[PDB]
Design a protein around this ligand. Sequence first.
Ligand SMILES: Nc1ncnc2c1ncn2[C@@H]1O[C@H](COP(=O)(O)OP(=O)(O)O)[C@@H](O)[C@H]1O
Ligand code: ICS
Ligand code: CLF
Ligand code: CLF
Ligand SMILES: [Be+2]
Ligand SMILES: [Fe+3]
Ligand SMILES: [Fe+3]
Ligand SMILES: [Mg+2]
Lengths: 270, 522, 522, 472
Amino acid sequence: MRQCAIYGKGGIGKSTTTQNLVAALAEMGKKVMIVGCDPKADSTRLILHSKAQNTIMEMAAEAGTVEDLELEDVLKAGYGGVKCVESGGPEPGVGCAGRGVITAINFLEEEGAYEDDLDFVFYDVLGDVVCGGFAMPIRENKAQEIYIVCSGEMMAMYAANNISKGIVKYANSGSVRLGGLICNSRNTDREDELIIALANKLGTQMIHFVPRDNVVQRAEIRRMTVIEYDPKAKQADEYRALARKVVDNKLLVIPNPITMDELEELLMEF
Amino acid sequence: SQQVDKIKASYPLFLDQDYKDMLAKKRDGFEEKYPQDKIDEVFQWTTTKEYQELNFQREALTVNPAKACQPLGAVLCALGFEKTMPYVHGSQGCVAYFRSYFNRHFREPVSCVSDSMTEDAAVFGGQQNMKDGLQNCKATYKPDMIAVSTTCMAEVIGDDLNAFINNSKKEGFIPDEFPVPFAHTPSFVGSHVTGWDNMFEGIARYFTLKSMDDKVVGSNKKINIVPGFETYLGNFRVIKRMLSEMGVGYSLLSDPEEVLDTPADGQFRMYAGGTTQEEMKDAPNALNTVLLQPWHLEKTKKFVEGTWKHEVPKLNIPMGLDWTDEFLMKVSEISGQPIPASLTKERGRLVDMMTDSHTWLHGKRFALWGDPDFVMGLVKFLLELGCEPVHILCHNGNKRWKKAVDAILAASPYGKNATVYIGKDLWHLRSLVFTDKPDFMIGNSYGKFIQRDTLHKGKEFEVPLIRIGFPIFDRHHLHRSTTLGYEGAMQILTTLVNSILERLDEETRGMQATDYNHDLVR
Amino acid sequence: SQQVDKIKASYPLFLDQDYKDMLAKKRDGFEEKYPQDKIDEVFQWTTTKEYQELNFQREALTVNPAKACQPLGAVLCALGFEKTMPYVHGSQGCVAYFRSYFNRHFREPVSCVSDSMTEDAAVFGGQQNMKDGLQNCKATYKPDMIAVSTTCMAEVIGDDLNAFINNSKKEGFIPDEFPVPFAHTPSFVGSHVTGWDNMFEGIARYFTLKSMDDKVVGSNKKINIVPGFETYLGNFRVIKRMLSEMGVGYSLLSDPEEVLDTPADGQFRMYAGGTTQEEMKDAPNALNTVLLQPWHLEKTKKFVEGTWKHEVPKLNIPMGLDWTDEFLMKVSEISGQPIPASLTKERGRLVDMMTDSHTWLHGKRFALWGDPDFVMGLVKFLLELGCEPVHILCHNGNKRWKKAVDAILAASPYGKNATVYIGKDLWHLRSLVFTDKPDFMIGNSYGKFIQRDTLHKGKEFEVPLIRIGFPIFDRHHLHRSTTLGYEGAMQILTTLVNSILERLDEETRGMQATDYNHDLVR
Amino acid sequence: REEVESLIQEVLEVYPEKARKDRNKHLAVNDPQSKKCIISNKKSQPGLMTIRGCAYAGSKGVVWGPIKDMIHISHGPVGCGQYSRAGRRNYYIGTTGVNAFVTMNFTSDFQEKDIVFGGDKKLAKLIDEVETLFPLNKGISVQSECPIGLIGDDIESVSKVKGAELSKTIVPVRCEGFRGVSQSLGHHIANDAVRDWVLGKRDEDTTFASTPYDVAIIGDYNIGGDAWSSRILLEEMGLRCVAQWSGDGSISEIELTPKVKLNLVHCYRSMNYISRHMEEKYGIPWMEYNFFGPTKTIESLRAIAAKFDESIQKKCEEVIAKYKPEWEAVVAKYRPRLEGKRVMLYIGGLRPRHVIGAYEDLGMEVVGTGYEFAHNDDYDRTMKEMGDSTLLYDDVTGYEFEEFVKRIKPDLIGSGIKEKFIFQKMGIPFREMHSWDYSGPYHGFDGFAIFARDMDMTLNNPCWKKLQAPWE
Ligand SMILES: Nc1ncnc2c1ncn2[C@@H]1O[C@H](COP(=O)(O)OP(=O)(O)O)[C@@H](O)[C@H]1O
Ligand code: ICS
Ligand code: CLF
Ligand code: CLF
Ligand SMILES: [Be+2]
Ligand SMILES: [Fe+3]
Ligand SMILES: [Fe+3]
Ligand SMILES: [Mg+2]
């Protein structure tokens, strides 16, 4: 089992990239399950072909505790047999969502969830890791492979560096490593100018790159994953390519976070 | 005014005429008190069944609870290991409250430290607090182990205890081999008993999880005893004495009896006794693991069965007659040692006292409260005595425990008038004892305020309190008593019968009114 | 009238309106009772001080005595030996009263027989009564030994126990080798403790007088322990435990703890435990004999010193802190065994309890009565606690004992207001507690009638009773408690401090009147 | 002086380097400007057994708790309230459960869902249930705990809405425990709560009839009736005590306080903020008084009278004359049992310097004193009282206090519960200076007798001579 964590800038296309990635690993032979980590649960919509409205947090509130929460009521199948568990939390501006992440991950640990025959558990975390709770997927015995998803725009790269700074402590204290940098696009001048540069400055690599394919948005409208909507398109081939790189990724070095001055110089360098 | 011959404390000094006049002037002038008649009507209304129906629809307000938070139990469990420092990662006011609570109950010094997180530590995390606190604690107090619990602040912000401790060890703040077990103890779930269970599971995991390749069950020919949250020292003592009279090898995990009962001989002993790290490391090799309080030892039971592969017996708390016999028989089966004549004699002595006092004990109505296992043991023992538990209250109880207690009650003709309440507090119990008056309550010191209220309704409505439980603050040295085993059964029996007799003597002390029943022999 | 769902016993059934009206009509019509105002006047007069001088001028009338007669102590001493039947040569009513007394105190069966001497036996003698009684007792109850005491009738007529027993043996009523010790126990001299002393001297003289040639002091390397008249079985247990923890060989002569605390298991045991005849015969070989209660073991001391040639230590009763320390040090000196660490720890624990409860115990005023050694040990322990004994009453005390207690009181600042009374009874004590009010009383159950009287004067004049001594009839299982040693001191300290705190809680349970002092933590 | 410095260095030689420098600045040798000698009100070093509490303890347990006709909600998990229920002996007169609620524990009893989804809705429902079940309550205070501060629950909006809807004062206090370093910030936050929500409600009301002899007792929490034992004296002097803060205090007295002529402040550390606010806004003069022991009581009574006309001074002289024989008799009885003894103290923020005069009145010397959470002004005040070459410790730890006591060896130690048994097992008499060892009062002439008797019964108790087994 390869427990991996998808981190990065908010809105950079994590659950999109993650969902088409796991769907490409699906119908390839392997068994995967997605675990989201942000209250506005929609990280499994594409696979589930519908928004969940059945997350760990609301069901725990209904029953009263997670002790009364049976596992089968929150885990569902999907495209290519992909298991999906959305865990959920409060509406914006109220409550504490990080505690919800803590409780839901602990519940998935207690109720036998990960100990099945699946290959990858893909945790998918929000862009704004504002507290330790959202860092639960990179605790000990948790996900071991971090794939920072970021684009060539400056702000995404700054977010990636900030995330690397944050995960340094967990990497030193444990065994979770930075698998590679996942590159989405904003149709900028970068695409190697500051993505390979940042990756090598972080001691890591860019594990494949996916550009601004317009097909992905119209597949999102269709509740669809690209390989499920247009299984013979260029975006779908790019997504099998990404799945293949994820399959044979071996570079697992500890992140080396570059300073702010280095980023500012790097912006002008390319 | 004060006379040097007879100095008066607050009572009865403030009953002097000058103080009464002062209070009357203050109340009449500046307090804007309600009329006394209004206060009487409202108090009368609080004792009525309509007020009970209003009280029992509460869904958001808790008044006078009967439980504490998890880190208290975590600290109590940590104190049961030798040269062990309870370290509560979080705020200081909590450790201050934990120490105050335990000093008032035990009248003993209690050792516990905090890393004293401030607003900056809440905003930025408590890793540096972790490092500095671990280093300072080890340097200053020199423990062999530091057992880490958490306050809620730390739980809410998701402070990774494991990562913080590993970073402390890796950066040289504390030696790598120095044992630092940890447990997450969020105060917003469960109670103190849950914190005890979580701390014990953390310690057992730390000492056993990675080194099970060389363990075989039954090799050290011992029985592991997990006492759980226990605030009676006589309970540890009676368990140890009964096992030793039996010839059974045993390992009492988390035994704080020595550290909480140190002698006053001119020196301060911060650490005393406690379970050793060798015993914890060798624990998987035992024949079996017995849990004295199974209803708050769930995580420990799961860990012991899953990891140590011990077939934990399904044993009720060894309280009363029947459950002490079932505990002794199970231990005899596991160890192979027969029950000695001393235990049989002491059982027969308990039965003798039961038959001696059954006439006064029969039919008496009791309300009671406390922790789940303690409450259910008290219920069972009262049923064995012919008494009638009426109001059974456990604020930190669950539905499975309530079903078990209902099954226990339904098996005896003395449980027909018994209702078990879970999630209800002492204000609910005040309503209950006003509406369906029992003869006595059995519970901790907080019940005294209920007694006062009943006495305010009238002498005939008063419900005396019997102090069995935790915490006991208004009496001295009751923490030295025993509740488990035949010895605890005799102590409880004596307390009950003598409380009944003292009340009967109080009601018949009136000259030429009720003294016709003021009998020399009862 | 009775409601079948709530059946009322005598109290409060006779508080019903029909019963009240009936009693009012009976009293008003046929009792010729004094007017109530006259009764209140007389009661107030009895509470005054002039009544105290009138009461203390008594020379012939004894009202509510605090002692019993010798054969009771003789029976209790006889019960301490293995398979021994107490045989009281005299009248049957005495034996019936002795058994009723001891059954009421111990809630256990008591075995005693009489020869049922009647007017014809009073005129002609009890020789034939003795022969038939010994024969029938040995046949029916099969004792290993018969220990003979006497009733006041038999002593007045001068029945020769020695001659009667020897003639019974020579005419075949009993085997010649069957041990039949005897002791003259005239009820008109001394008290029950004197009877115990006489009976012990008789048994020891029977087993040791004629076989002193082959005896060497210290050959069996043991310490003889004579407990005296003792009604707390915990005292026997604590002495045995403390000697066993020291690794000291001992011989508890007249040990009745087993027969007075027999288990209930479906069968009745007439005999259980007790001192063996071999132990009694080997007693002169011991290193020394220690008398736990020297102030009623004078004859035993004389016999042991003059016949066994033992240098009996001058030791007080092992009560309190200092005297238990001395007892331990003297035993350690006699036997050569060092005092172990466990006894040191228990002593330190008692010191911790005293320093914990000193704030509440200090300055409290106690009246107290009982037997000489018990009373004096209580006085010493109370002085150690900072309490002030005020009235010290010992009905069966003597001038030398009073001198010793006065010397004890003079050595402490807390005995400056203490007066020792010998030959006075509980009516004297009632006058004393009315005129010089103590905070509490310490005595047997009879003192309850004093407390009632005080409460009739008012709640402010009530002197609560603490039941320590013999006999206790209105409570249960108090004979199982402990008085000697560090365990007994701890029990007494807890009882005293909790009595103080219970009274303080009762005095401040009044809402809006005194409840400002109803503190949760005391 | 050199010996004290040597002991300080020896004690400090056990803490790690950073801890050592930090603890070095909170220990000093008294030289009768405290900033140049000792620094206070700083963060405690982690893992050293500090004694300090939290802001919630200083707000709910100290300021708002003694207010009797109000209902105080410990908003959050159950622990805080449970541990602080009836733990402080702030005496009051009332019918508990009807019109007084000091010894009661009201709480929201937060669960996991409360943290995850917020507790404002539960707070509103709790306010409604409180109003239903306790109708004679005259107000509500909501004391926040740590999770409330963390998750940002808008308790102020709930307080405003429910106060509008049910027409009663609801005071939201942001006293989450992690704020500050001790109870001092809790005192401060509670004081601004009183200022913002209670103090000015009667600002436009002129119905109260005021006399020139109007005084308000400020910062007296009626420990063991202490405030009462003071109030009588102030009333025997002709003054009218309108309000008491906050022991046995009512919301009406606090509302009536801005009408007084003089504010007699007992506890500076906890109420000086509201005292200065009232001086600046309503123009009421305020000043400190000390009623511990007879000499300070007489000095304070004369100082109080000097602020008024001649009749008050004559009544003060009469009161002093009346109470003179009682305290003279108490001195003549209890001094010889106490002359020459030495006391070491460690109390919270006011008492280490106030009780010194009463100790001196019995012929007893204080050789060491210190504070848990006092500021620099408190040390400025206490420098004059303390003797030369004495010891001062700020936020002392368990090890430091134990070592200091081991080397100094005082006759008596007056401090809190968390070290009472510690020093009891070292054979040194110890007297709780927070709860008065469940005794008291100690204020005033009546309290001086109890203070002297307690001092004698603890210092001279025979139990202290029995800690060594005769065979060892
Ligand atoms: N390769 C792509 N081509 C076109 N649109 C994309 C691509 N990747 C992401 N997007 C669009 O950008 C949005 C990113 O949202 P989301 O996937 O939720 O990002 P995150 O999970 O990081 O917030 C998606 O709604 C999607 O329509
Ligand atoms: S309020 Fe303060 S700790 Fe000034 S928090 Fe504390 S009832 Fe102390 S030294 Mo307990 S600043 Fe009052 C105090 Fe002093 S509770 Fe009492 S005794 S005079
Ligand atoms: S048969 Fe009856 S009870 Fe017996 S003596 Fe005779 S009248 Fe009396 Fe009185 S004191 Fe004791 S118990 Fe006796 S030995 Fe004398
Ligand atoms: S500073 Fe949270 S429930 Fe309350 S005891 Fe703590 S674990 Fe338990 Fe501490 S006391 Fe409270 S929690 Fe903070 S405000 Fe002060
Ligand atoms: Be996002
Ligand atoms: Fe103690
Ligand atoms: Fe019996
Ligand atoms: Mg997303």
